Symmetry: D2
Subunit: 506 residues, 4 copies
C-alpha cells in the first residue's frame, strides 16, 4: 500500500520546508524504499516559466526550485507532474467542464477541484512507482490560496486507510532575547488553524533562532495534541548534515512507525562521508560573472565538484572597465552563467580569461559570450554579437531558431576536452534557451581555432552544443544547463573538470 | 459617486435572495435611480451553458436564471457581464499570466483574483451607467468557493469611501413548533462567520416559516451589532407584492439613508396596480406539453399575459396514446415549450390542437414539432422529422445549420396573425438552438397551407422564424424564446395573443 | 475500562438532546451495563435554585430538568454531581487558588478550569460505579460559554485511550417546503466549528421537520467525515418509543462497536410493553389547578400512573368565581400542584373537590391549600391562611420553620388511605419547601376530622407530611414532591392511587 | 465625552505592551488630559497576592507589575480597580446571582460577565475623573481566556458612540536573517483573529528584532485594512525614550485625531530632560543582596535616585562565608531588599556594611535583618532572630502582629537621618508584610545605640517604621516598600539619600 507523508508550513514561510521534505525523503531512501516528492505551489501561475531560479526537469517543465532540491536529495529525475499549482488545477478542471466532461453537473471547488488535486498526486506517484510519496504544500496554513490543497490532502486519510498517511507541520518558535524565552503560542495557533480545516498534525518540526529545548518541545506537545516524541527541533546548522541530525533526533524512526513500517536501520554512509569531505583537503576560489536562489543549482554544482576534488570552493561574485586584473587576482577560474540586460562586461571577462589562460566555463549565455568574444578578437568579425543584444549586428554569430527545454541529446566529439570530462560519446543535458550559435558562422570560427566539441542530432536540430580551445589549460562552454543534472552522488563533469583545472591553476 | 449594495446569504441557500435583489433594485428604480444588478455564481463553470432554466441575455450569454429576475424587475437588458463565476475569473487571470501580462509577478488569489473580480463589477456598472449597483453573491457565507468574492466585495468599502457601500445579509430563522419558538442562533453564527472574513453586515433580512416578530428581530439586532431598524422580516407571501411589503417595512428608506441619499418617496404605482390585477376578471386554463425553475421565464410570460388580459391563468401540465380528449378537456389552449428525449407525444398534441381548433403556441422545439406535424399529416411527407430525433428520416424538414444565441432580428410578414400581435414589421427575439426549418421543404409546406409569417435577414441567416395557419383561431410557433424578453411592464405578444385566444376559446 | 460517550448539540438548541441522552443511556442499560448520565449546563448559575421545572435529587440538589429525564430513563438516583455548571467550576477553582492550593501558580482556563471539569466528571462516575457514562453538553457548539467544556471533553480522548470515548453531535436539518428540499449546510458548518475546537464527531443525529432520507443522510456523511452508518435521523414521534426507534436504526449497535464492546442483543421488553399500553383500556380526564416544562415531572407522574392503571389520562388545565361546576364537569379528579402569586382560587377548588367527593391530590402547596381550606370551612377558623400569602392571618395554620431539600423520611400511619397506596410503614420522598403545617393547630384540625397520615422523625423535624379524610372517596395531600421519584418502571403511589379513584369516580 | 483607547496584543506576549500603554498615556498627559490606565489580566486568580514583582497600590491591592509602570508614567495613584482579572469578574457575578440579584434570570457570559467587565472599567474611570482611559488587555488575542474581555471592549464602540473609542494592536514581525526578510504573515493572521471576535484594529504597532521598514509597514497596512499612517514600529532602544520616539513617529498625533481631538503640541520637556541625564555626570556601583522583574520597582527607584543625583548607578548582585571584602570591593553601598528562604548571609552583609561604614538601606526584610544584626552583635542578644526564620529563638526581636497593606502613615522623628531625607514630619508609604519589630525589645535596642526614626499612629499600630544609626555615614531601614511610590518625577527619598551617600562614599 502506498504511503503518503504530507508536509505543511505554519506561522511564516522560508523556514526550510524544501530541505525538510528533501531530507525526509532521503532518510526514507536510505531505508530501501522507492520514494518521490511533490511540491504544491498554491500560486495561480500555471508553472514557473513566467517568473529565484526556475528549475528545469528532463521533460522540459519549468518549475519551482524545490524540485531541484528533491532531485539532488533523491538522486531522481522528476517531471512536471511533481510540481502542482492552483493554475494547473483550475485550468484543467475548467477546460474539462467546457468540454462537457462533467455531464451537465455544477462544478465546485469541493469535490471537483479537490478530486483533480488528489488525482494528480496519485497519477505522478503511480508513474514513478513510489512506495512512499512526500508531498510538500507551499504557502502558509491559513491563507486562502492553500485551502483547496489542504482539503485535498485531508481527504487522503479516509481514502488511503489507517497507517498509510502522516501529516507533518513545520512552524516557527520565536526567541525573544530580552526575556530570553521561547514562544510556542504561534505554533499553538497555527496547529489550531490546521485543525480548523480538519487536519491534526501527527508530527511537529520546530524552527527557531536557537535550538529548541526539550522543555519547550514538551510544552508544544502538551498544547497541540501531539505526542512529545513526535515534536522535533529544526536548528540552523552544511545542508548535507540536515538529514543526518534529523535521523539522530528520531524523525526517521518516528515517520517509520507511524506509517506502520517495521524499523530498518538507515544506511547514511553517503551523507556522512559527504559531510566528512565538507574540512576539505584544499581550497580554490573561482569567480562567477554576475550580480542567491537565482543560482541555486549552479552553486550546488560547484559544491558537488569541490567534493569530487576533495576541495572547498570559495565564490567571488564578479560583476562585469579594464580594471579586471584586480577583480581576477587570487582567483583560479572564471564562470559565466546563463542569463540578460548587458553583456559587454562579460565579453570582457571571457576575453581576459582567454588571454591569461584562466580556467573558463560558460553556461548557456556563457557559451554564447565566449563565441561572440572569439568571433571578434580572433575571427576578426568586428561588432559580432547575438541578435538578442544587438538585432542589427553585421555578424549575428548567435541568433534565433526558453525554446529548447529539458533533456536534449549531445554528441561529444572524440578526444576533446569535453570528451575527457564526460568519458562518453553521448549524453543528455537540460535546456532552456531560444538563442543558438548561428550555423553560417561555424565554419569560419573553427578555421580560427574555435573547437565545436558537441552538437545535437536534433529532436529538430544539428546545432552547436559545446565549444572549447585546444589552447588554454581549460576553456569550455555548453548551451545547456549542466548544473540541473548535477547531484552530490554524481557531480556534473563540466563543473568537476572546471574545478580540477582551477586546482591545477592553483 | 456610484453606490454599491452587496447582498449575501447565510445558514442555507434558496431563501429567495434573487427576488430580494430584484425587489431592492426595483425599489431603487421607483426612486428615479439608474440601477443594475449583478449575480455572482461561485461555481467553477465558466457560464451556465453546460448545465433550472438557463436564461439568455440579448448578447447571447447563457446565465443563471436570476438574471431573468433582474431583467423583469428592472425592465432592463443585462449582459454576460452581469453574471460572474469562479471559472470566468480564474480563467481570465490565468490566461493573462500566461501572456506574461503580470510582468513576471507571482499571481495569487489576493490581490490578482480579487482585483479581477472588482474590475468586472465596475466594468459592467460603467457600461450600464449605473448609479446604484446591486451585487448578489451566490452560495452560502462560509463555503470556501465564495471566499475570493467575499474578500473582493469587502475591499469596496475602502475603495469607494464612506457612504457608498452597504452590505445586506439574508439568513434563516428556524421555527420549532414543539417549543413554538424562533431560533436566532444560526443568524448569530452566520454573521460571526461574515465578520471572520472581515465583513460586518449593515442590514439583516430574516426568513422563517412564519413572519419574524419584532421581539425576535430586536434580539437578532442585539447579538449581531446591527441596528434594530436595520433588521427586517422576509415572510412567505404573489412575488409582485414582495417589493411592496419590503418598502412598507422600511427597507427602502433604510438603504436610502445608509447610502447617504436624501429620501425620495418611491412611486410604486405599477407594482400596486399589478398585484391589484393579480383577484382577476376571468380565469382560463392552458396546457403546457411537458413534465419548475426549468420553465421560470415561460411561466412568468403566461403571468404577464394573464395580466394584460385582466385574467388569471391556470396551468395544467400535460405529459405526452390517443387518450388526449381527456388530457385536453377543460383547457382552452396548448403550449409546446422549447426542449429533448422523445417527441412523438408532442407531435400528437400539435395534431390534436390543430384539428380541434385549440389555441396553440410552440416555442423553439414547439415550432419544429408543429412543422413536423404539418409536413406529415397535411403535406403528406410520411416519417417527416428533425434530424435531431431521427437522423435517417427521409424528410428532414428540421435540420442543422444552442448555436444561434441572443437577440436576432425577425421580419414579420405584413397582415399575418404574427403581425397582429407585434403590430410592427421588425423586432428582436432571443435565441438558443441549433436546429432550424429546412430551407428545401419550405416551398412545399406553404403550398399545403403552412404560413411563414417571419424570417431573418441573418447576422448569417434567412431562416424561418415563425409559422402559423390562416385557418384555426390561433396557431403560432416561433424559433426564438420570446418569454426571455417578456416583462410585467411589457408582456410578450405571442403570449398575450395566445392568452387572448384562450379567452375567446373560453 | 470506563467508557465515555459525549453528546453535543449544534445549529440550534431544543432538539431533544435530553431525551437523546436518556434514550442512549437506556439502550446501554438494556445491554446490562452500569450507566450514568451527566448534564453540563454552561450558564454561570451555580445551580438551578435561583431560577421550566427545577428538579430535585435525593441529596437535595436543585438541578436542570434533564436530570429528571435521566433518572426516569435510567431508573437511577442521581446527585448534584450529575449537573455541572460554569459557576460551580469557576467558583470551585477560584476558591482553591484563594487558599493558595495552586502553590503560587498562575491559574488559567486551560488547564486549571478544564482539569476541574474532567475531575468532576470522573468523580461522579466513580461514586456511581459507572461502566459507561453519557455526558450531555448543554448549549450550542460555537457559543463561548461552552468552550471550556468542549476542551475538557476533547482531552478525554487522549486521557482514556483508544476505544474508550465516543462523540455524538445532534444538529438540525432545516426543511424548506417551497423547494421541498432538506438543507445539510448548517450541519456541515456546525461540524466544522466542532473540528475548530479540536473535535471530530463520530456519530451524527439529524433532527428535521420531516424524517431525514438516507440520501440526505448519506450526503451529510460525505461532507462531515462521518461514516454513513454513523448518521441517524431523529424524527418527531410517545417519548417512550424514542429509544425503540433509535435501536431499530442501529444507534445502539453503532455506539457499542465504536466503544469496542462485543455486541449484546438489548432487552427492550419494558419499553415495548410500555408503549404497548400507551392504545389504552380506558380514559379519564383529571384537572390540574394552574396556568409546560414547569410541570414535567408532575405530568410524567400522571403518565406512569395511567400506565399502571392501563388507562390514558387527559389533562384539563383549570386556572383558579363560583363558576366551577363547569370548569369541573367531565372531570374525575382535581390536582393542586406545588407552587405562588394568589391562592384563594385554589382554596376554592379544594373546597369544591371536598364537598362534591371528587378525587383530590395536593402536592406541596396543594396540601397546605387543603389544610387552609379545612381549617376555615370545617374547623371554623375564619381567615385561616399560610403566613406566605397573609403574614397577618389570625390563624397561621401554615407557617415557617426551598428549605427542606431532597429525600426526607416519612412515617405512614397504619391502615390509612396513605398506607394503602404505599403498602409500607416508611418511605423517603423529596422536598423543596419552606412552609409547613403549624404544629399548634394540628390538634384542633384532627378533632374536626382532618387525618394526619404521615409525619417525619426529622433529619430535624416532627412535621406533618400528609393529610387525608376518612370521608371522601379519595382526598390526599403530601408536603413533598412525590412526582420527583416517579419512574415509568415504578409509578409514584399517590399518583397511582389518585388515578385509580379517578377511574372509580368514572 | 470620555475616550477609550484599548490596547491588545497578538502573535506572542512580552513585547512591551505595558510600556506601550504607559508611554501612550504619558503622551496624552503631555497634552493636558486627565488620563488613567487599566490592566486586564485574564488569569483566573482574583488578584496577584497568591503569586515577577507584585506591585502594591495605596489602597492595599496586590497587583500585576504593569500597575507600577502606569503609576510611574502617569505620576498617578491607581487602585485595585485598575487591575481586572477573570476571577474577580466571575466571582463577582457569581455571588450576585447567588443573592438572587439577577432576578431568576439565567446568567450567561454574554451579557452578564461582559456587562460586569464594562461596568468595572467605567466605574474606575469615573472615580478617577478620567477624560481618556487607556485599557490594556493582557494575554494574546486568540486564547480563550481573553474572549469575554475582547467582547466587552468591542461593545464599547457602540456604547460610547463615534469618535470615542480606538483600538490598538501590538504584534510581532519576525525577522529571518538567512533570508534577511521581515515576516508580516503572523500580524495578518492575528488581525484576522481579532476581526473574528468582531474587532478591527485602528492602529498597529510592530515589534521586531530590527526596526520595521516603511516598506514592511506599508505592506502590513495593505493586508490588515489599517491606514498606512496608523502603522508604527516599536523598536528596541532607555525606556524613557520610548514615549519620545513614539511621539516622533506620529503615534501621538494619530491617536489624537482618531479620537476627534483638536491637535495639541505635547510638552515632553520632562522626558527629554530625563533621557538627557540618562550620559550622566558620575557613576557609583551599589550592591543588592539577592539572587529581574522581581525587583522592577526597586531598580526603578535606584534609577530615579541616580537621576536626582545626576549620576548613573551600576548594580552588582551579591548573593549572600566571610569572603565579603571581595564581594564588596569597588562598591559604595549595600541594599538588602524585601523578601524568604535563608537570612544569615544577609545578616552577615548588614554586619559588614555596619562595621566598614558602607552606606546601607534595608527594605522590609532588609530592616528586620539590620535589627537582628544589631541585637546580636551590639545589643548582645545571642541567637536573636525573627520568628519567621526561627520560631524558637530566645530573642524574637522581629515577630508577628502581607498583613499590613498599602499606604500607612509614618511619623518621622525630628532631626534624624530619616528626617533629613524626607524633610517632613509625616508621610505615607506602602506596606506588604506580616512581621514587625517586637515592641518588647525596642527599649534595649535604643539603649545600645539603635535609633527608631519612625513609627506609626496605627490605622491599628504604634510599630517601628524606620531605624538608623547616628554613627555610620548612612545606615537606614524602613518596614514599608518606599520603592512603590518612587516616580521619575519624584524619586523616593530613602533611595535618593542612599545614592547620595554612595556618591560621598565614592
Amino acid at each position: 500500500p502506498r504511503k503518503y507523508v504530507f508536509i505543511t508550513g505554519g506561522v511564516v514561510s522560508s523556514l526550510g520546508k524544501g530541505i525538510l521534505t528533501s531530507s525526509l525523503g532521503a532518510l526514507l531512501r536510505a531505508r530501501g524504499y522507492r520514494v518521490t516528492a511533490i511540491k504544491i505551489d498554491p500560486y495561480v501561475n500555471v508553472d514557473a516559466g513566467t517568473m529565484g531560479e526556475v528549475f528545469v526537469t528532463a521533460d522540459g517543465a519549468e518549475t519551482d526550485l524545490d524540485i531541484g532540491h528533491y532531485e539532488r536529495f533523491l538522486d531522481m529525475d522528476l517531471s512536471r507532474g511533481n510540481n502542482l499549482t492552483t493554475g494547473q488545477v483550475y485550468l484543467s478542471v475548467i477546460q474539462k467542464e467546457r468540454r462537457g466532461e462533467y455531464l451537465s453537473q455544477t462544478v465546485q471547488v469541493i469535490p471537483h477541484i479537490t478530486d483533480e488535486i488528489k488525482e494528480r498526486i496519485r497519477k505522478v506517484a503511480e508513474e514513478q512507482k513510489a512506495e512512499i510519496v512526500v508531498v510538500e504544500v507551499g504557502g502558509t496554513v491559513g491563507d486562502i490560496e492553500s485551502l483547496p490543497f489542504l482539503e485535498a490532502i485531508r481527504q487522503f486519510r479516509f481514502d488511503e486507510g489507517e497507517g498509510n498517511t502522516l501529516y507533518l507541520h513545520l512552524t516557527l518558535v520565536p526567541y525573544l532575547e530580552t526575556s530570553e524565552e521561547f514562544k510556542t503560542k504561534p505554533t499553538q495557533h497555527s496547529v489550531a488553524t490546521l485543525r480548523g480545516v480538519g487536519i491534526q498534525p501527527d508530527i511537529l518540526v520546530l524552527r527557531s533562532a536557537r535550538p529548541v529545548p526539550e522543555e519547550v518541545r514538551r510544552k508544544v506537545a502538551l498544547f497541540t495534541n501531539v505526542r512529545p516524541g513526535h515534536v522535533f527541533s529544526s536548528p540552523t546548522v552544511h545542508l548535507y548534515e540536515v538529514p543526518l541530525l534529523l535521523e539522530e533526533q528520531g524523525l526517521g524512526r518516528a515517520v517509520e512507525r507511524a506509517l506502520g513500517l517495521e524499523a530498518v536501520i538507515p544506511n547514511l554512509s553517503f551523507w556522512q562521508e559527504a559531510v566528512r569531505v565538507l574540512h576539505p583537503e584544499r581550497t580554490v576560489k573561482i569567480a562567477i560573472a554576475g550580480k542567491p536562489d537565482a543560482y541555486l543549482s549552479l552553486l550546488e554544482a560547484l559544491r558537488h565538484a569541490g567534493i569530487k576534488n576533495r576541495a572547498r570552493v570559495e565564490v567571488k561574485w564578479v560583476d562585469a572597465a579594464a580594471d579586471l586584473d584586480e577583480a581576477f587576482r587570487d582567483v583560479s577560474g572564471i564562470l559565466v552563467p546563463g542569463g540578460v540586460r548587458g553583456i559587454e562586461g562579460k565579453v570582457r571577462a571571457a576575453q581576459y580569461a582567454r588571454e591569461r589562460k584562466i580556467p573558463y566555463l560558460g553556461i548557456c549565455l556563457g557559451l554564447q559570450i565566449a563565441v561572440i568574444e572569439f568571433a571578434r578578437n580572433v575571427a576578426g568579425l568586428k561588432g559580432a554579437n547575438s541578435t538578442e543584444f544587438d538585432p542589427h549586428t553585421p555578424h549575428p554569430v548567435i541568433d534565433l531558431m526558453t525554446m529548447r527545454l529539458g533533456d536534449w541529446p549531445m554528441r561529444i566529439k572524440p578526444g576533446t576536452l569535453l570528451h575527457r570530462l564526460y568519458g562518453k560519446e553521448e549524453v543528455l543535458e537540460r535546456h532552456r534557451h531560444r538563442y543558438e550559435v548561428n550555423p553560417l558562422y561555424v565554419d569560419g570560427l573553427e578555421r580560427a581555432g574555435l573547437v565545436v566539441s558537441a552538437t545535437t542530432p536534433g529532436m529538430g536540430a544539428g546545432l552547436v552544443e559545446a565549444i572549447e580551445l585546444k589552447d588554454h589549460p581549460f576553456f569550455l562552454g555548453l548551451q545547456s544547463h549542466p548544473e540541473f543534472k548535477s547531484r552530490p552522488m554524481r557531480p556534473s563533469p563540466p563543473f568537476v573538470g572546471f574545478v580540477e583545472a582551477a586546482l591545477a591553476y592553483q
